[PDB]
Symmetry: D2
């Protein structure tokens, strides 16, 4: 079973299945993919849609004429398949001009160029139906302490995003921005390194309602953080506009393994959260088929992304629907966590002797939380061993 269909909202970046396998120590192991072929092959696997950087679709430095022919070909393929383009983004990291950043490059003329390059692709993104425009500032940062005044850099970053929002607002576009955090690589430290830092920064923008986050499983895991917890906080703030799904084995370089690889239990708790919170955005895969693979392995790895999501969804639904799990949740007082601590108010709390003067601290301390039995039920459900 576990066959994906378009209703599952699975999307892929052109740059994922199209990764040629060049890494810091090795040349490409696969030939380039025509974006048209990717659209058609992904349609046939059950995907909902594709996403793109400007430079994935239009080779850098293309004339106005060549650009229009690349776009018309791609549009033809989308029209033939019904495939959607829910998200687009800008490549502000590959070309050598961006070696010190785009929006926060020390050189002012690079920052202006970065903004104009971005603005041009927003126009295309909106024409193609994108609802979210992602910004990953992979070159915004430093290898050394004196190279970047971080307060000035944040001024410039706020300036850039404020201008993008003025632009979308002035055009009447119905598109929103999502900032994708990453703690490091390819810069020694990248600005806004986690979901938390990006959420804080959004609250200083002129129009914070236009901006949310695009968290990536493996990126938060490169800081050793709990990805489901961070997604919970982004949901709680109302800012989970988009999400990048993949796998990562711990704190090391950015692996971009297929979703479900890496930390499998984190993947389980992630799917449980997304589904029980009713997240309705794309399930987007930002992953790289390992460079050991040929083109058959590329499509196997892509199918595996969707397969693992669908299996985990099933196990998480079975977990929450199990009356034994519901009983375990009550034994662990998850339901008391949802009750307000003091809806009776501050004065009532202060005058309540049962909350302090007469509180039996030893009796309360003695109560087991019963968390291990609950977690073993979760393990049994994940492994399909409830029998």
């Amino acid at each position: 079973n576990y066959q994906p269909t378009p209703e599952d909202r699975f999307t892929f970046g052109l740059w994922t299945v199209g990764w040629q396998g060049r890494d810091p120590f090795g040349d490409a192991t696969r030939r380039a993919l025509d974006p048209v072929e990717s659209v058609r092959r992904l349609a046939e696997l059950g995907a909902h849609g594709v996403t793109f950087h400007d430079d994935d679709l239009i080779p850098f430095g293309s004339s106005d004429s060549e650009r229009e022919e690349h776009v018309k070909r791609f549009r033809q393929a989308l029209d033939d398949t019904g495939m959607k383009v829910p998200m687009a983004t800008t490549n502000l990291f590959t070309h050598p001009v961006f070696k010190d950043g785009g929006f926060t490059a020390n050189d002012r003329d690079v920052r202006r160029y970065a903004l104009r390059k971005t603005i041009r692709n927003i126009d295309l993104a909106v024409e193609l139906g994108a609802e979210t425009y992602v910004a990953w500032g992979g070159r915004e940062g430093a290898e050394s302490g004196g190279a970047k005044d971080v307060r000035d850099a944040l001024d410039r970053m706020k300036e850039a995003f404020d201008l993008l929002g003025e632009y979308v607002t002035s055009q009447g576009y119905d598109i929103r921005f999502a900032i994708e955090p990453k703690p490091n690589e390819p810069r020694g430290d990248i600005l806004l390194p986690t979901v938390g830092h990006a959420l804080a920064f959004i609250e200083r923008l002129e129009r914070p309602e236009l901006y949310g986050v695009n968290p990536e499983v493996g990126h938060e895991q490169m800081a050793g953080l709990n990805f489901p917890h961070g997604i919970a906080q982004a949901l709680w703030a109302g800012k989970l506009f988009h999400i990048d799904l993949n796998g990562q084995n711990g704190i090391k370089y950015d692996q971009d393994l297929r979703f479900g690889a890496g930390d499998l239990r984190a993947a389980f708790w992630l799917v449980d959260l997304l589904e029980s919170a009713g997240y309705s955005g794309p399930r987007h895969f930002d992953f790289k088929p390992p460079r050991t693979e040929d083109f058959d392995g590329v499509w196997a790895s892509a199918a595996g992304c969707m397969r693992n999501y669908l299996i985990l969804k099933e196990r998480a639904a079975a977990f929450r629907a199990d009356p034994e799990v519901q009983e375990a949740l009550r034994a662990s007082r998850l339901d008391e966590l949802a009750r307000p601590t003091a809806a009776d108010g501050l004065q009532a709390l202060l005058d309540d002797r049962s909350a302090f003067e007469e509180f039996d601290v030893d009796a309360a301390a003695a109560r087991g939380m019963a968390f291990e039995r609950l977690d073993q039920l979760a393990m049994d459900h994940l492994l399909g061993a409830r029998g």
Copy 2:
């Protein structure tokens, strides 16, 4: 040289020099310190003031009578020395009743107790002259995914902090709150794990102006993050109310080494930022003398904290005052980072052909940033090798 004086604003927690050296695998190696003796010994070392958890000063479970005698003794010592109490905090982590948290414990009655325990110590803190009240939620979190609904937990955490602000507001107290993040330990994952997550959460509180952060060097380093960058972001947001200074060697358990130990270059860039941003709060040391040490080693380690700050301050001031460093900063275009990207406005940017159509991307890409020469000047200044 490098003798500290009270004007340097160095402060210490009672629980730092007073750490008896019990760790997860070993019993105490030092006898307990009388808080009065700590105040006097710290005064003689040059400290500005001390800080405390409620339970450092008043043994847990003390009667109203015993509590008043502990406080009067301590007040006597402060009055005799002129030592200040700029910050206080609550112990919501040692007693077994807090094993699932304080403000976000699943059990409602523990959460109510946690709030009443906190409120009582705010009253004492304000009476003693504290300007900042720190909250470190070291038990707020989980070892397993099903144990904590993180959205409900954030509701309860917001509820608790909103009530604390209502309380200080209703009493007319002039005291502000600072949330201290930590990514893990003693819980498997702790809620609000970084400076970023804490900053974001503050923006959802009813009265965000009452709350800032208390970042700790070693805690952000337990997520492998760049501590100066995070402090820069907290300054940029106006939320650096307090700071914990210490050392940490990488991603492992929380070491709480004396300041300057651990990542020495990060300490250098930290001091350079605090001094050039004009941070005027306490330089507070949250550190543990290693349990190898006797009481002479405790006071040597404490003196070393202040000594290393003063040496680094001197090297950072010499760095910024060096005309060769100023020249290097200009060669790296740090001054162009402070110029607005587009103060001419969005329409002018769109109509500027030099920012895109006629932008010579190859010429710009060819410009070296000269960052290594600048960083070697910083190294030479840190090592006192400018000769």
Copy 3:
């Protein structure tokens, strides 16, 4: 199903289920367990045997008289249940005298004491039937660079282990030593931090055949290493004398979660290796029930250790027995890895033009490894989704 029986060779340390839950920031949450009660409760869960530190069984500082009464009581419990004692070890880390180490303490008289304390417990271990004597040097190490001359420390460590082997040899005991590595905690860096370092060091001992390793899942994971790979290397060397099973979420403090928690796919590949290599030693659990739990949660967590091993064993056996997996292994050329590279010899290799001069490097480079399809079969088997 998945009921453990004594034939499964599951063992537990007295100090695991008996952990009272004192951590660096909190007091005990559970009362102490009588070792007799642990033996009986573990027998009833299906365990094969127990292990112990000297100080778990005999309170430190006991008289010759009290010691004999503690041991006779324990022996009575083993005799009543048929429970075995396959392994024992020394506590050279809790008492303050060991704060700078046991075998590599700077003070010579502590090192002599450490050896005499160890030798006394070897006698007891052998009397009780232990086949392996584990050494975990948790205090051997340093927080600072100048505190320990590491070459001299390794001399002292070799000296200590050489003396232990002379002792067992002179007594004619049939017991072997296993060194348990850990990279850090409670010391800033611990000597012999990984399986690799311990294996190398053994080769410099006078009688290397008496010494192997006791690797712990979570310890190698605290260095971000691949635990199955390290176990493979220890097997390849013939030195896997014992093993500690538990779980760990990444690079942070030592969590000692129940086995199967933490990195679940690593647990799967671990069980697959142990079973396909025919490891016949104890499956020993060195874990801590979280301090959130009461005594019912202690025994639930312990049962969960054995349960997860048995489930993973089943999934790994099904994986290897699947003809589709066998086909996938051949497509990935795992069988060609077992063929010698050049059993024809060096001169034949040098004269073979097909290995260099006429080797079609492009054809070989083009071959996909088909690793993702193989790994998705492994995922399907782990999740019980082969249907």
Copy 4:
């Protein structure tokens, strides 16, 4: 001051200063360097010598004719400058044929090719005067558990190194091998991931005297290990044949910063060890000038490598020569660490009541180690603040 001269034995890889700055997310920012120009520019900076991969010097796929012209040009440059070639190595990682490894590729014909490619460059290395031949198995490893049988892979790795030693032995070459460990990148996990694992593996080779290690500062730091401790263990074993010097900020991708950047105190303790142990091999820099830099920044970064070594050497010599530091070392009993624990023998130890029965454990436990005062003296010396 701190001017390097050839007597300082500083060496550089052609691939360091010649790094064009292509990273996983960006194209080259610098033009290629002619190896002849590197030799001459490095001679003028004070370098002792250069090192090379085969493919740095001879473009891959060169004819016998083109190869001889590349080598003669390079030889001319060495002869003109007196520059030495103390070490050489093989590129078994860039070409797509090595995507699953060289010596441990699943495909047998790739392994044979890998050996023939290596053997050809040993001949050249010896002709040019190299004393050490380094092997870095950067593609030996896996992204997934089923892809590599690690025991079979270690068989193949031992087979390959045994054949290389037979070859050098049969030719009568006076050259030795050094294995360079790395824990991960570009493979998900690399075989022999640390200095420890490499040392253990050497002891299973047919002729272990021909093999040692080439540890790299940043590589051991990618596992969060203490690099000086690991070097101490390699010295203690007699296996430090070569060393790679650079910098790394923690557990993340391999940064290859200039030496002295990254963990500065670790660099200090490293230089103190190398100099006090009398290491007499090359001080080799395996580093990458950041891709932000132009060619002036390349040579500034290279000079900085040597500069920082010379400054740290001076500070470490001043540290050890300080009578106050000698006094501190005695107070911390570093001199008692060098005394044998029991040169009186096992029977004398067993019969010594002062080592156990009459050992005053409380008196010994009470002794402070005085480590913090010693470490603050080390800090003062590193920072040039002894005044």
